[PDB]
Amino acid sequence: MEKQNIAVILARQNSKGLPLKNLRKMNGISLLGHTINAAISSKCFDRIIVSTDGGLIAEEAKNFGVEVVLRPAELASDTASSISGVIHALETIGSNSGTVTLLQPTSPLRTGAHIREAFSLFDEKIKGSVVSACPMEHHPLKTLLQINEYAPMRHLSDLEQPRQQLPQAFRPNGAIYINDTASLIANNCFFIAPTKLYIMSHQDSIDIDTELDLQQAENIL
Amino acid sequence: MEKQNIAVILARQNSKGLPLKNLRKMNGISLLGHTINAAISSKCFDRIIVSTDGGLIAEEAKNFGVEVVLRPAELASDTASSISGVIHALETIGSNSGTVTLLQPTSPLRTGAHIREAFSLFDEKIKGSVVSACPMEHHPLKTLLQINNGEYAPMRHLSDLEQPRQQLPQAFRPNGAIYINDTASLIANNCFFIAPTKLYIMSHQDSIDIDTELDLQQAENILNH
Ligand SMILES: Nc1ccn([C@@H]2O[C@H](COP(=O)(O)OP(=O)(O)O)[C@@H](O)[C@H]2O)c(=O)n1
Numbered sequence: 127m128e129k130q131n132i133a134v135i136l137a138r139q140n141s142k143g144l145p146l147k148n149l150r151k152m153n154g155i156s157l158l159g160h161t162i163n164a165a166i167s168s169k170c171f172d173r174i175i176v177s178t179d180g181g182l183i184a185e186e187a188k189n190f191g192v193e194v195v196l197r198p199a200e201l202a203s204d205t206a207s208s209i210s211g212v213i214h215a216l217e218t219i220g221s222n223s224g225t226v227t228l229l230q231p232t233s234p235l236r237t238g239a240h241i242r243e244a245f246s247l248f249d250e251k252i253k254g255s256v257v258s259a260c261p262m263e264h265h266p267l268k269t270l271l272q273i274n275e276y277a278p279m280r281h282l283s284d285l286e287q288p289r290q291q292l293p294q295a296f297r298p299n300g301a302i303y304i305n306d307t308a309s310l311i312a313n314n315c316f317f318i319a320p321t322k323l324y325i326m327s328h329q330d331s332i333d334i335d336t337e338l339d340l341q342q343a344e345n346i347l
Numbered sequence: 348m349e350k351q352n353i354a355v356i357l358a359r360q361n362s363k364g365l366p367l368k369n370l371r372k373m374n375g376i377s378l379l380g381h382t383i384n385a386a387i388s389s390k391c392f393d394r395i396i397v398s399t400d401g402g403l404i405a406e407e408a409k410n411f412g413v414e415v416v417l418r419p420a421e422l423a424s425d426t427a428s429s430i431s432g433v434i435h436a437l438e439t440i441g442s443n444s445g446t447v448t449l450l451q452p453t454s455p456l457r458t459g460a461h462i463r464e465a466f467s468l469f470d471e472k473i474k475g476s477v478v479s480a481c482p483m484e485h486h487p488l489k490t491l492l493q494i495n496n497g498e499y500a501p502m503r504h505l506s507d508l509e510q511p512r513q514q515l516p517q518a519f520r521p522n523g524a525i526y527i528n529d530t531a532s533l534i535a536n537n538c539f540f541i542a543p544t545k546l547y548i549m550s551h552q553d554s555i556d557i558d559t560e561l562d563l564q565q566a567e568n569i570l571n572h
């Protein structure tokens with residue numbers, strides 16, 4: 127089977143917070159539409175799949191010229207893991223070789239340009255993940271974890287060390303997760319060593335969860 | 348020398364962020380004043396010292412009935428560490444025994460009661476630090492550190508990145524509001540974090556740090572509630 131670069135956009139219809147979140151408009155285009163446009167304008171994929179449980183999401187995806195995979199309710203529940211979602215999608219279309227990229231619609235400021243640049247980091251030989259990430263406001267080394275009562279993340283001295291003396295800290299932003307397809311299937315997870323990062327600014331890393339996020343991101347445009 | 352509980356409030360007059368920040372009023376009382384009030388109302392200290400480099404700060408502190416320590420330009424510079432400022436305060440008044448507490452004027456919502464509660468955690472036998480902290484929005488284990496230009500490594504486990512928050516140890520970060528230490532220990536260690544460090548948990552709201560004009564508004568809004 128020839129290798130294929132597949133984009134999987136998990137877009138279940140219901141959302142804890144904003145109802146019908148994936149269909150909420152931002153500048154007149156649904157979140158789903160924005161991510162779909164990013165996938166298309168990136169030109170990094172041979173196949174773009176939108177996986178969902180509802181007819182309304184399906185209809186929207188189709189209008190955008192991409193493929194639709196219908197997820198069973200069980201795989202679209204609040205306790206349904208995204209990894210199981212992506213595995214089901216790859217099995218449905220029968221692909222197990224190439225690359226598979228998860229693109230969440232909740233990261234509407236992530237553009238095709240972003241995806242493409244993140245793709246240039248993927249190493250075909252090593253096959254580690256390429257995950258988009260953004261800088262941390264509060265440095266993770268200057269924290270403590272409860273154990274019962276608390277212990278420093280690393281050293282106590284870290285808590286008094288100025289940023290410049292400490293390593294650069296970054297956190298995944300959920301916009302992009304690129305992996306070698308066979309590796310993701312074998313590992314059953316999105317982070318595969320050696321994981322590489324694609325750095326995105328705080329602005330473009332906005333993640334839609336509330337009505338406020340929607341307006342905020344609608345302004346950044 | 349008899350033991351004394353000392354409160355040190357480092358308040359340089361100038362700020363490259365918010366001009367004359369420590370003198371900026373919030374609901375009629377300067378940031379400095381709010382922190383002095385918290386130190387006084389806590390009733391946890393035998394002495395309250397405000398360390399500064401300027402006359403306007405000193406005058407303000409005096410109006411509150413507390414002691415003033417004058418810092419050399421070098422200890423008030425933008426690179427001067429807070430610990431060197433506290434050491435200097437203790438040396439100036441001559442205290443090297445009891446407890447010393449740093450109370451930053453930039454945490455106006457940290458009250459006298461907050462301080463009192465934090466002190467209840469201090470163990471004068473073990474002599475470990477008591478630092479106020481608040482929960483993290485983003486879990487610190489769900490991060491990676493840069494090693495070499497374009498190479499990174501996870502904080503701990505690569506698997507932690509995908510682990511559900513509920514299944515990870517609760518994380519906290521010092522909020523800069525309170526640091527309580529045995530004085531002898533602080534002087535010998537020359538740092539604010541001494542094992543075993545206990546945390547006094549505070550909410551995000553009460554942990555507001557003042558760095559910008561907006562923070563000041565948010566702080567006044569929270570009070571005006
Ligand atoms: N089992 C799942 C889980 C999430 N998702 C989708 O993945 C995206 C991110 O989910 P999320 O709950 O983390 O969104 P936020 O809480 O980050 O705002 C949304 O478009 C969800 O509908 C899905 O299609 N299936």
Ligand SMILES: Nc1ccn([C@@H]2O[C@H](COP(=O)(O)OP(=O)(O)O)[C@@H](O)[C@H]2O)c(=O)n1
Nearest residue numbers: 357358359362363364427428429451452453
């Ligand atoms: N060496 C130092 C460091 C901090 N501080 C005070 O501690 C608080 C927090 O420091 P900061 O770094 O946010 O003050 P800025 O340098 O941002 O103006 C402020 O009230 C400062 O004036 C001080 O008086 N001396």
